[PDB]
Design a protein around this nucleic acid. Structure first.
Length: 93
RNA sequence: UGUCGAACGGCAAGUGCCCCGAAGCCAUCGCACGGUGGUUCUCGGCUGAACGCCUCUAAGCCAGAAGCCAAUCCCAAGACCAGAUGCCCAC
């Protein structure tokens, strides 16, 4: 059990990310994307001036440390979604 | 065949026997009918770390078995129904 394990992402200029009890909402160029992260028990916080989002697990062994970079990756797939969006291409073979 | 004397009407033979026979019952020997939703197993996946990449799994999702649970179906308040009601009485 460690005392502080964290990882931060950097919010770009044009994206509003804000949390409300483990429940993020990302408003960019293209719309909003809510992600209900209630099942995780983390300290999600946004700096709002230096534009950076922070996940913190305090006294975690190894199992909740795995859910830190999961949360960081999910918010990045919403910042990519509201700024640039997603497009796939499938092919009939 | 016997027997009321004969014809008539019958009768006896534990329903004499033979043919046809309504109604009723009945045959896969006839006839009619036999329907919906979900959950999630195997599994194949999606995002996604631990483990700067990778990965269906760890959080989280998707789709999904003749299984399972409901709907329909049958009994049904000792499931004690201030569920609704008709009429009398009693407050």
């Amino acid at each position: 059990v460690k005392v502080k394990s964290l990882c931060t992402l950097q919010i770009p200029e044009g994206v509003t990310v804000d949390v409300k009890g483990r429940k993020v909402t990302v408003t960019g160029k293209r719309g909003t994307l809510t992600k209900d992260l209630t099942h995780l028990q983390l300290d999600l916080r946004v700096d709002k001036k230096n534009r950076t989002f922070t996940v913190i697990r305090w006294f975690g062994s190894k199992i909740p440390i795995a859910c830190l970079n999961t949360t960081k990756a999910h918010v990045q797939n919403m910042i990519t979604g509201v700024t640039k969006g997603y497009r796939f291409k499938v092919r009939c073979a």
